Amino acid sequence: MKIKSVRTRVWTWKGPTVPPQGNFCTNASDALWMKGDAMSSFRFHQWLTCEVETEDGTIGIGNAALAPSVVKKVIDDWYAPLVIGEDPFDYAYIWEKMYRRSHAWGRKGIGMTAISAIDIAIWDLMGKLVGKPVFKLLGGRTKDRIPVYYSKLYAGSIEAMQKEAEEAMKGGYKAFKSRFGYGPKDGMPGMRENLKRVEAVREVIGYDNDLMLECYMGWNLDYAKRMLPKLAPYEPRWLEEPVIADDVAGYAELNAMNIVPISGGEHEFSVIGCAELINRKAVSVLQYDTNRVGGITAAQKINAIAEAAQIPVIPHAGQMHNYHLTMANTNCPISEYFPVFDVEVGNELFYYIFEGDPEAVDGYLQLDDDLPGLGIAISDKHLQHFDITE
Amino acid sequence: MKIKSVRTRVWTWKGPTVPPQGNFCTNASDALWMKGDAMSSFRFHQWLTCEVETEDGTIGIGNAALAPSVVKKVIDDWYAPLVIGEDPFDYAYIWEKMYRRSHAWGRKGIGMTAISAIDIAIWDLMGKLVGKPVFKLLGGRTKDRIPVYYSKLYAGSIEAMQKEAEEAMKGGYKAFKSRFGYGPKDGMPGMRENLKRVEAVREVIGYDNDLMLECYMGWNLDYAKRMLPKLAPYEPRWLEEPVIADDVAGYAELNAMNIVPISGGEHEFSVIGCAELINRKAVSVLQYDTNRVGGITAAQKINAIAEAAQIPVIPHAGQMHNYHLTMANTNCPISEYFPVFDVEVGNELFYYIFEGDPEAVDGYLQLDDDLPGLGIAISDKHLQHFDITE
Amino acid sequence: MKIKSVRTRVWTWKGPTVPPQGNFCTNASDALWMKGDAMSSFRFHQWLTCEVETEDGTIGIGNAALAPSVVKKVIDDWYAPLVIGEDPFDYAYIWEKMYRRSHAWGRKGIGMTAISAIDIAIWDLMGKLVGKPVFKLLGGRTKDRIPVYYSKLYAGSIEAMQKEAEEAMKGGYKAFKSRFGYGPKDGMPGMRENLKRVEAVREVIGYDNDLMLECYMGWNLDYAKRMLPKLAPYEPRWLEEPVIADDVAGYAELNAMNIVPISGGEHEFSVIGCAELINRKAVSVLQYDTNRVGGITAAQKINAIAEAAQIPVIPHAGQMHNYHLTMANTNCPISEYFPVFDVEVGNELFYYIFEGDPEAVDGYLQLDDDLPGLGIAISDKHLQHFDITE
Amino acid sequence: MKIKSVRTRVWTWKGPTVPPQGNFCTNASDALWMKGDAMSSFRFHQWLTCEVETEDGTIGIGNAALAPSVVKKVIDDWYAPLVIGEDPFDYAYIWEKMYRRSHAWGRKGIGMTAISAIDIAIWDLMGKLVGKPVFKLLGGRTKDRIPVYYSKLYAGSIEAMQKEAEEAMKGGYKAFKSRFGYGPKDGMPGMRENLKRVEAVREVIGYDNDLMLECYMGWNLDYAKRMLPKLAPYEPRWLEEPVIADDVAGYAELNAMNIVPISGGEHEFSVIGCAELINRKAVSVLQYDTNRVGGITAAQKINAIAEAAQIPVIPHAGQMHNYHLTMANTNCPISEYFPVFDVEVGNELFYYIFEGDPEAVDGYLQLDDDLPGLGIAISDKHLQHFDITE
Ligand SMILES: [Mg+2]
Ligand SMILES: [Mg+2]
Ligand SMILES: [Mg+2]
Ligand SMILES: [Mg+2]
């Protein structure tokens, strides 16, 4: 049984969205002085689906969110030819072909993202071909159920943030992640605005629950080092992406301070790429997203490396392409969970494109031991809200 | 489909054997002053087979060579109960159950060896259950064929060693491994006896081929450091196990000298165990044996770690439990090949117990893309040469 | 005078026991999701006695608790032949014979445990042969009496834990060790349950006494790093085995943080094995158990290494095989003391098998300057509570 | 004066080319077992031109060779909008806008390549706007003329390689770079084939001239370490890209051996990206290509970092986008020079698209002190050999 085709489509949301607000989420563009929504270039109002079909009609479903139209071009023009005609079960070799043939320009970023979408599809395909859930092929059930942390709580008025925290608490979660809305340019006043909101969330979820904090590459080494001592009293479980992805040295410096655990990796690429974060102890928690880092083939290898180093792997984003990996490794304790929501930043956009991603129940997710593949299908429920290009 | 039983048997060779000779192979016992064959406690004239059967009668075949009778007792009394009743495809969880429940006493040695035999069996079983060769489940075909290095050439008279080298050359190999017969206790005279034999082998295979040298834990840090400069002129590809397995610090010191690459790992256990050798750069080439280190589940993870570090993995021993792993990873360039031979040290004993292990052709081995599992079966060809206990 | 025989027996308790309770003691199996008593595979309801007798009838008594039936098989089949016919006073050579001949599979775990039981017996034998207490042969009296810390206080209701602490205080101890009942899987709520119990014990013993905390390999690097800052206010003297034994790198990372001293080693094997923990500063306090690490011959060497590094040695378990070593070295300040108790976890099981182990008086233990050997004998007081297999 | 438009075109060569040959140039795809020309995915038979025009009609010319069609899409869809309407002299800010807004997916690879083409164009534009050569704006004339090393000598028959070397010598160069045609998979026989060709080139150019050796990511850490001692006798000035670009740790290990200087960087991206190679001493010579690494803005910063570390910068490729930078920094001693040639690998393709790149005279290149900008223009001499898409 050989692969016959690779169908890649870009889905562009054209339905209503939540209007952007200022001091909502710190980001890498804050350092500039551009007008408008600072999250503009980071929102996901587009998504990519990648369907790999074999001669017998079986179809595997992969996906990606980073620069969809460009990633699609890479898949169509460069990678599809390296995949078509191959046995899905030569997945490691197929992965290596893409990685090496395009090494000059694709080892990180666009290239690796395209590899990710294809690879995820190939795994869904393999699972379907042998009638096994992807997580079973990866090792099976290491957890009776997957705990998740509520991931949202963007910065806003104290009233709005506490209102959301109260609502989130009703979900039964024992961990919550909130975003900062102020950074370096805001100086000390901004530091106080940040601390006031960390405290506000703590007032609602209390100290019997975990609180993770998200910077989304919006701070820098200097500001982050000065914030750590101020954040420690609030006992955050981790501080995510305090610096831009290129500043790995900064990550290592911050993490070695042992004031507040540093997490990151959603913007790191390839097995070696993540292996470096692990070996250099750049992070206390690794958060690659399988649809960016290189796919399930790469993520499985990364999980082995992180497990040996005993650095927890908690993938970025709550989707089946991550849940299956987490289920199969003891060093993957919990998953990130983006609640179903209106199209805001876009992390929830996949809920409108796919059917099958589990929803949290009392703070836990579950996988089906018998459902082959990833257990997802492309949805036709919101076609009227999308402009799909092929 | 659940596992129904675990059948473990110890096969004891009672047929003719090659009489022991002195200064044949250096080993960890050389440091003592015991009489008799120095390789006595290291020979493999016994082997263990482990058959894991599911309710439908499908059987997976695993094996082990270290302390067979003791390993069998551990499997029968401790691990079998943790395996029976489980889904073979929860292999990572099954592995973790054994590893953690027995962590106090089994993380290395007897315990991990028992885990290895069971795990290998579970993988053969999974392959058969879904009709796929084990290497396909692990990643597929990364090589058109597997190159191998001829592994024998024990120390002896110059005439005998050169005669064997001439014969080995007819096999078409481009790499050969030879053993030393003199160590620390033999002082400088022994160093010269060693160098004379390295040179003798080189005279036959020439410098257009690779030559690996084996110490089998028979030297020590001191002697090895003094030998390195003397060996370098002969351009050996690597020096294997120059020190006892516990002396990891010694490994690291020797390897860091960058005079002759140091290899090892056949006596290291668990994923973390091998991860340490990799991270500490204790070896330039990692050589765990899948039927010792923790099985295919562990070996697959170790291969990911070694690949990211770019330290080649060339498993100890040439058997299907290693070949399949090697085939699926680009960082596994060649395999060790023990030629079919009379029962001498015992590394060739598995040829008398199993059918299916490929034989070298012009220095290469091949795997069948369609044969499910490991592609081996227990042989009934030499039952009269064994006393099998169950 | 030569050794004539080695008699090994496994004693299986069949008398009443204390029913298992949940959240009693964190352990390496907590990470799984198995049903039943989490301490099941760790309890010691069996014990091994090893009697080495010389031609003149003198008998030395050794023992071991890890996987008794398997350890016995190793002693009977592999090590006994290397010991019989030898002079007990060639103990270092006898030790080396076992260590090197079985190095491929016994350097840690089952093998080293078997070596331990035999070696301890050989020392008791030597002491009897020359009419000297073992501690005298090791260096003599470095302390007027041996201080001990009360070791029990498993996790339970606050009322039960404080009740035990009150009772323990009546013993006059100036140090107490308590176990955690919650770990990683319990998240922040579990962290609070842990802290509440640390505080509860502190409320009873106060701050004029020392409090040690035990994780028994039930936490992981991540969770432990996050707990350290929370534990510091309670001023614990040390945090024991926060990670599984294989994670030595984790030990080193945690210990280097200098927030709470990290202790460990009860699950480490051989002289080099412990030397690595010392050199890598993996622990602030080393706790090997002589009947696991390699016996008195190995423990004596380890004590020399730890003393030079000035890392206190406080052996795991309170038995004569440890007390004698502690008495002879200035760097061994106190001993662990398991109070005589009903058969619960099993650490107290040896009290039912041997006679002679000293009991604490006002927080101190004493050794007899004239009693030859270890000063113990096999007891016939509880034969009706055991099924002894030979 | 503001930027009005960004015109990006992809030029596809459709004229005659030199037929591919085996064992011509080692590369990252050699590790696979694909059929056909191993350099297929690495050849440059396409090129990209990027023209940035201001309101007054002044046009700056930039370019790129990596994945042209994809890079073009990124420029047209993502970066053009961030550039149009801006003052060319806010180049550092323009650069930062692109780098940060697209940081999630463009920090390396496609994204940074697109930034490179635009940035180079902006510099050519600035030079034209103020009537100054780009090198003057960067610091001026630090060298009376720029020495260059002849870069070609691909692997082939000894006769062909020596014939080319003889011809190259007539050019007056004092340095030459040659490529290997054998790698890891070829084993020792391949090592000898490599050494035979290094020696053959040395026989022609002698030892009064420098010889650099190119691996083009075709070897691995293992093979490279074993080759170093064998190459040293030939006194190569450096060994280029012995490992794939992701293996920075490997680079550092190899370079630290100090056997043969290691060079690399043509596949590294961004200022921080190259800063890491410098700080980690991954290379003895840094070779980024300005039309890949991030443009002249980034290259200028990288040159400052390399100069302080005293690690020579010798940019990959001989084109004006590199020559101007080299001319302005004392730590940039020589430039790589691809001779004008038929379309073979494609490194010479730019000669058919642009007019103005200087040609070597007796081993030196010269820049015009009065010619504004980069001193190049798009050529109409070979339009019939190209299919240009806009
Ligand atoms: Mg994040
Ligand atoms: Mg070996
Ligand atoms: Mg303990
Ligand atoms: Mg190059």
Side-chain angles (χ1 to χ4, degrees), chain D residues 14-86:
Chain D
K14 63 181 180 180
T17 62
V18 181
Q21 294 300 314
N23 300 108
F24 182 80
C25 184
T26 51
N27 59 79
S29 81
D30 287 334
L32 307 165
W33 51 285
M34 289 181 75
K35 286 287 297 180
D37 170 36
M39 283 292 281
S40 183
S41 72
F42 304 112
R43 294 177 188 273
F44 304 115
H45 288 186
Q46 290 190 304
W47 213 279
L48 174 156
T49 58
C50 183
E51 291 167 274
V52 180
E53 189 179 320
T54 47
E55 292 298 317
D56 73 327
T58 305
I59 302 174
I61 304 171
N63 72 285
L66 297 179
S69 65
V70 179
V71 169
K72 168 173 164 58
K73 186 165 181 57
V74 172
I75 295 176
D76 297 335
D77 301 350
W78 272 269
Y79 301 150
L82 300 176
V83 177
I84 294 174
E86 300 280 0

Side-chain angles (χ1 to χ4, degrees), chain D residues 175-196:
Chain D
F176 306 78
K177 189 165 74 183
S178 178
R179 285 72 175 156
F180 290 112
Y182 308 81
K185 286 168 57 182
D186 303 298
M188 183 55 87
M191 298 182 123
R192 299 302 169 196
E193 294 291 350
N194 280 326
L195 299 166
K196 172 168 56 181

Side-chain angles (χ1 to χ4, degrees), chain C residues 13-319:
Chain C
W13 180 260
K14 63 181 180 180
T17 62
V18 181
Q21 294 300 314
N23 300 108
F24 182 80
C25 184
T26 51
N27 59 79
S29 81
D30 287 334
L32 307 165
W33 51 285
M34 289 181 75
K35 286 287 297 180
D37 170 36
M39 283 292 281
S40 183
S41 72
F42 304 112
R43 294 177 188 273
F44 304 115
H45 288 186
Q46 290 190 304
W47 213 279
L48 174 156
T49 58
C50 183
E51 291 167 274
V52 180
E53 189 179 320
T54 47
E55 292 298 317
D56 73 327
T58 305
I59 302 174
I61 304 171
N63 72 285
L66 297 179
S69 65
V70 179
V71 169
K72 168 173 164 58
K73 186 165 181 57
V74 172
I75 295 176
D76 297 335
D77 301 350
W78 272 269
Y79 301 150
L82 300 176
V83 177
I84 294 174
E86 300 280 0
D87 172 6
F89 287 90
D90 279 329
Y91 68 88
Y93 181 57
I94 292 173
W95 192 93
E96 204 68 17
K97 294 176 66 184
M98 294 185 282
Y99 180 57
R100 288 176 175 278
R101 295 275 284 195
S102 70
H103 206 73
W105 52 264
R107 62 192 182 85
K108 294 194 190 296
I110 300 298
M112 192 56 60
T113 297
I115 288 177
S116 299
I118 294 172
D119 186 80
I120 290 170
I122 291 182
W123 272 88
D124 180 46
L125 176 56
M126 283 187 282
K128 291 175 177 172
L129 289 172
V130 295
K132 294 290 180 179
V134 164
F135 83 86
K136 286 289 184 177
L137 295 179
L138 295 172
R141 182 175 290 284
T142 67
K143 288 171 276 291
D144 71 314
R145 56 182 173 175
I146 305 175
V148 303
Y149 68 83
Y150 175 86
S151 188
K152 199 171 187 300
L153 288 161
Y154 283 101
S157 68
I158 302 302
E159 187 184 309
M161 294 186 79
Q162 295 196 309
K163 178 182 178 303
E164 186 186 339
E166 293 283 12
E167 189 56 42
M169 281 288 273
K170 297 179 180 180
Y173 309 95
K174 301 172 183 179
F176 306 78
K177 189 165 74 183
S178 178
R179 285 72 175 156
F180 290 112
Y182 308 81
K185 286 168 57 182
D186 303 298
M188 183 55 87
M191 298 182 123
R192 299 302 169 196
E193 294 291 350
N194 280 326
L195 299 166
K196 172 168 56 181
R197 293 180 168 66
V198 168
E199 182 167 303
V201 173
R202 270 298 188 195
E203 181 179 1
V204 179
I205 66 175
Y207 282 80
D208 193 64
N209 290 308
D210 271 312
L211 174 58
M212 290 74 138
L213 301 172
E214 173 72 275
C215 305
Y216 191 51
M217 307 193 290
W219 291 1
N220 56 38
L221 181 50
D222 166 33
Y223 186 85
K225 286 195 293 182
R226 291 185 281 118
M227 278 298 284
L228 293 183
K230 298 170 165 47
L231 292 169
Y234 296 105
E235 298 176 44
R237 179 158 170 173
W238 76 61
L239 180 63
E240 192 166 327
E241 291 203 296
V243 300
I244 58 176
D246 273 329
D247 189 19
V248 176
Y251 261 104
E253 186 175 342
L254 287 164
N255 201 46
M257 295 174 72
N258 279 127
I259 297 180
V260 175
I262 305 298
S263 77
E266 71 185 63
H267 292 116
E268 187 54 85
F269 300 86
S270 89
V271 181
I272 292 173
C274 285
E276 281 280 43
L277 296 183
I278 293 170
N279 299 330
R280 301 173 67 174
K281 292 197 193 72
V283 302
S284 285
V285 170
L286 183 61
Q287 312 168 296
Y288 63 73
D289 193 333
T290 302
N291 69 354
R292 298 179 185 186
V293 80
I296 295 176
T297 297
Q300 181 73 332
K301 292 182 172 181
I302 296 167
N303 284 0
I305 302 171
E307 177 177 30
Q310 285 295 92
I311 288 179
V313 167
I314 300 173
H316 162 278
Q319 295 183 62

Side-chain angles (χ1 to χ4, degrees), chain A residues 318-366:
Chain A
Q319 295 183 62
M320 287 297 220
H321 59 70
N322 288 326
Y323 300 144
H324 281 72
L325 284 152
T326 286
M327 175 60 86
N329 191 294
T330 303
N331 182 62
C332 299
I334 58 181
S335 297
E336 170 162 40
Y337 184 69
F338 294 128
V340 179
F341 196 71
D342 300 304
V343 175
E344 186 182 56
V345 174
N347 293 126
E348 60 283 313
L349 190 60
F350 74 84
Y351 283 123
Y352 297 88
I353 300 176
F354 306 102
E355 286 176 51
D357 290 292
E359 283 180 56
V361 175
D362 189 48
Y364 299 99
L365 293 175
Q366 185 57 277

Side-chain angles (χ1 to χ4, degrees), chain B residues 96-373:
Chain B
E96 204 68 17
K97 294 176 66 184
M98 294 185 282
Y99 180 57
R100 288 176 175 278
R101 295 275 284 195
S102 70
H103 206 73
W105 52 264
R107 62 192 182 85
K108 294 194 190 296
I110 300 298
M112 192 56 60
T113 297
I115 288 177
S116 299
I118 294 172
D119 186 80
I120 290 170
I122 291 182
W123 272 88
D124 180 46
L125 176 56
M126 283 187 282
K128 291 175 177 172
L129 289 172
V130 295
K132 294 290 180 179
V134 164
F135 83 86
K136 286 289 184 177
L137 295 179
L138 295 172
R141 182 175 290 284
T142 67
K143 288 171 276 291
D144 71 314
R145 56 182 173 175
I146 305 175
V148 303
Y149 68 83
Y150 175 86
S151 188
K152 199 171 187 300
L153 288 161
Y154 283 101
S157 68
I158 302 302
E159 187 184 309
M161 294 186 79
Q162 295 196 309
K163 178 182 178 303
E164 186 186 339
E166 293 283 12
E167 189 56 42
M169 281 288 273
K170 297 179 180 180
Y173 309 95
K174 301 172 183 179
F176 306 78
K177 189 165 74 183
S178 178
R179 285 72 175 156
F180 290 112
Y182 308 81
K185 286 168 57 182
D186 303 298
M188 183 55 87
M191 298 182 123
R192 299 302 169 196
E193 294 291 350
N194 280 326
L195 299 166
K196 172 168 56 181
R197 293 180 168 66
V198 168
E199 182 167 303
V201 173
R202 270 298 188 195
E203 181 179 1
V204 179
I205 66 175
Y207 282 80
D208 193 64
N209 290 308
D210 271 312
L211 174 58
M212 290 74 138
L213 301 172
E214 173 72 275
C215 305
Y216 191 51
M217 307 193 290
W219 291 1
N220 56 38
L221 181 50
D222 166 33
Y223 186 85
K225 286 195 293 182
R226 291 185 281 118
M227 278 298 284
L228 293 183
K230 298 170 165 47
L231 292 169
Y234 296 105
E235 298 176 44
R237 179 158 170 173
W238 76 61
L239 180 63
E240 192 166 327
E241 291 203 296
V243 300
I244 58 176
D246 273 329
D247 189 19
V248 176
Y251 261 104
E253 186 175 342
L254 287 164
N255 201 46
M257 295 174 72
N258 279 127
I259 297 180
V260 175
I262 305 298
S263 77
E266 71 185 63
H267 292 116
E268 187 54 85
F269 300 86
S270 89
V271 181
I272 292 173
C274 285
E276 281 280 43
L277 296 183
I278 293 170
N279 299 330
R280 301 173 67 174
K281 292 197 193 72
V283 302
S284 285
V285 170
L286 183 61
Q287 312 168 296
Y288 63 73
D289 193 333
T290 302
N291 69 354
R292 298 179 185 186
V293 80
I296 295 176
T297 297
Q300 181 73 332
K301 292 182 172 181
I302 296 167
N303 284 0
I305 302 171
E307 177 177 30
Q310 285 295 92
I311 288 179
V313 167
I314 300 173
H316 162 278
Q319 295 183 62
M320 287 297 220
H321 59 70
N322 288 326
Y323 300 144
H324 281 72
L325 284 152
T326 286
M327 175 60 86
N329 191 294
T330 303
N331 182 62
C332 299
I334 58 181
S335 297
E336 170 162 40
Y337 184 69
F338 294 128
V340 179
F341 196 71
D342 300 304
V343 175
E344 186 182 56
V345 174
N347 293 126
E348 60 283 313
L349 190 60
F350 74 84
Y351 283 123
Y352 297 88
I353 300 176
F354 306 102
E355 286 176 51
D357 290 292
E359 283 180 56
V361 175
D362 189 48
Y364 299 99
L365 293 175
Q366 185 57 277
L367 297 186
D368 193 311
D369 297 312
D370 303 306
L371 188 57

Side-chain angles (χ1 to χ4, degrees), chain A residues 177 214 240-241 266 316:
Chain A
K177 189 165 74 183
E214 173 72 275
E240 192 166 327
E241 291 203 296
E266 71 185 63
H316 162 278

